[PDB]
Scaffold this active site. Structure first.
Site: not given
Ligand SMILES: *C(=O)OCCCCCCCCCC
Ligand SMILES: *C(=O)OCCCCCCCCCC
Lengths: 330, 329
Positions: B117, B253, B284
């Site tokens: 990520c 994130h 996500n």
């Protein structure tokens, strides 16, 4: 307003070392072809190395990095970051870089994986040099690694004898003189299918008992693109670094095919005594790993010397190219 | 005896725009699974799933188009594109040249960057580094993800977490510095914390075994992110020469709302600092999450162009990457 701080790093940046890892298993044309002359004439390949079953893209990259470190006279503690360039890391996640960093005993250092087909090395080299000059790092590992053997369709008579395994790493750091010229790069997305995995993993995952994915190559198309377009790329890379073709000591193109590379040597108008990488003979095409492996082979045999002015050109998948002028490491 | 040219580009670089693409199909907690159960644990209410004919690359293209439009630029103005993803389901060719071709700038330089990520943070850094070094003047950086096909609908640990989307930024010369120094690192000893469980080749050779899925060691990831990214944040602010109290916008994130809530407190920002919460309707999206979260804040007007933002990417490989930026668009 608050002004965002800018950092600065080294001005002069170069290749401190190269370290190569080549798998033990030697696969001859005669072994794989079950005609040696036929393969060698068309490709320049006599033998190639295949990694063991317990070996991976990351594990060979780690070994290569160990060797690069030793040749630069450094420990893992000296390293600020690591870029892994590869096309055969067979996991969507986690990336190879952090695993490599951990195996080397530098678990905390920054790093990522970079994929640009065979040209990822030039891209990763460029990125490292940019990062170091930017102040984001002082010393970096750049490692091209490839385990292509499990991706080969051994009934595909167009490519099965081309691809091979291996890893090589360079250390990029501060040098007394400029050692890495500007990165010259581009692509041709319109010819993306020329070098491909034929079936995407998700389509395959939904029908595992059907045909499985293999590497596919449209050879004639790649031959013509590389042979005819990469000359101009080399010239751009030399012009950016402010050097003449006749000043080039060593030519390290991607080891895709000897015939392609002979045509490039001629197109580039190099000195008759220029040293041309020919590692493909016993290494095959190892994609992202091929340039640094070819660099190591020239240094190992004494054909090239550290400090020699080298032109590197990477070309291949996605249809991607990256090139730059460098001084030979070690 | 032979000089290799020393060069340079624009010292001051920044984000000129952000463009976001989100798939049409809204999947609710109720459809996917208990609404209150998922929301309590993650802060997710809904998420978006891409159509079958959509890919990470196609979504990246669309995100790029919008970014270009939001910058008032065309594909002709761009010298290169970096695609960061974890769900380009081909070993080769890379996504980047395909995105460039689809934009009508097929010749431009580009590559795929994979770092879980944290790929966006790294790619942002790399793009700015490249511009300052003179290798490019204006670049696209796009995070993209098609995560839905990787979800095991019986994995009650994570099936409700992951979703699809893409967002891109245009990076170029700005009058004043717009992208702070990259603060990054990793922890490879915790590589199995977020992973594809079975490698593709092992799977290909044993089709009668299980197929691969995304697996997540939640507790291990939670601990690491909630208690370590605070210091990462502080290192990124320090590098950019800014105090915590100068931060207007915080974009971590979008892994988990609760992690991010603990991060906000640890970071000791202004009580009125704006905190990205795009996970609530986006879920996500890994590499796409941060630019998507930026675009969401700008769209709602919670954030404004010029705002001082702290970005922290964390996740797989156990990798992190952070910087202070000025909000774009
Ligand atoms: C350089 O251009 O070579 C590219 C080789 C990469 C091929 C990746 C393997 C894809 C097939 C997966 C089964
Ligand atoms: C951010 O940290 O995201 C990491 C998650 C990426 C998952 C990739 C999918 C792996 C499973 C492939 C079937």
């Amino acid at each position: 307003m608050t002004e965002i701080a800018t950092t600065s790093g080294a001005r002069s940046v170069g290749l401190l070392s190269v370290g190569a890892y080549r798998p033990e298993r030697v696969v001859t044309n005669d072994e794989i072809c079950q005609s040696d002359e036929w393969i060698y004439t068309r490709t320049g390949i006599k033998t190639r190395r295949f990694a063991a079953d317990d070996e991976s893209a990351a594990s060979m990259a780690t070994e290569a990095c160990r060797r690069a470190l030793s040749n630069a006279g450094l420990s893992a503690a000296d390293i600020d970051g690591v870029i892994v360039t590869t096309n055969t890391h067979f996991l969507q996640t986690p990336p190879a870089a952090p695993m490599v960093a951990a195996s080397l005993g530098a678990k905390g250092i920054l790093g990522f994986d970079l994929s640009a087909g065979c040209a990822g090395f030039g891209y990763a080299l460029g990125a490292a040099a940019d990062m170091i000059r930017g102040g984001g790092a002082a010393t970096m590992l750049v490692v091209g690694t490839e385990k292509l053997s499990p991706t080969i369709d051994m009934y595909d008579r167009g490519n099965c004898f081309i691809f091979a395994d291996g890893a090589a790493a360079v250390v990029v750091g501060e040098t007394p003189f400029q050692g890495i010229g500007p990165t010259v790069a581009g692509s041709d997305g319109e010819q993306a299918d020329a070098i491909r995995q034929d079936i995407d993993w998700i389509t395959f995952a939904q029908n595992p008992s059907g045909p499985r994915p293999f590497v596919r190559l449209e050879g004639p198309a790649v031959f013509r693109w590389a042979a005819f377009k990469m000359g101009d790329v080399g010239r751009r890379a030399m012009d950016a670094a402010g050097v003449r073709p006749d000043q080039i000591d060593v030519f390290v193109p991607h080891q895709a095919n000897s015939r392609i590379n002979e045509l490039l040597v001629k197109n580039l108008q190099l000195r008759p005594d220029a040293v041309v990488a020919n590692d493909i003979e016993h290494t095959g095409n190892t994609s992202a790993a091929s340039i640094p492996l070819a660099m190591a082979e020239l240094l190992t045999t004494g054909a090239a010397k550290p400090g020699d002015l080298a032109l590197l050109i990477g070309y291949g998948a996605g249809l991607s190219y990256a090139a730059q002028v460098v001084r030979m490491p070690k």
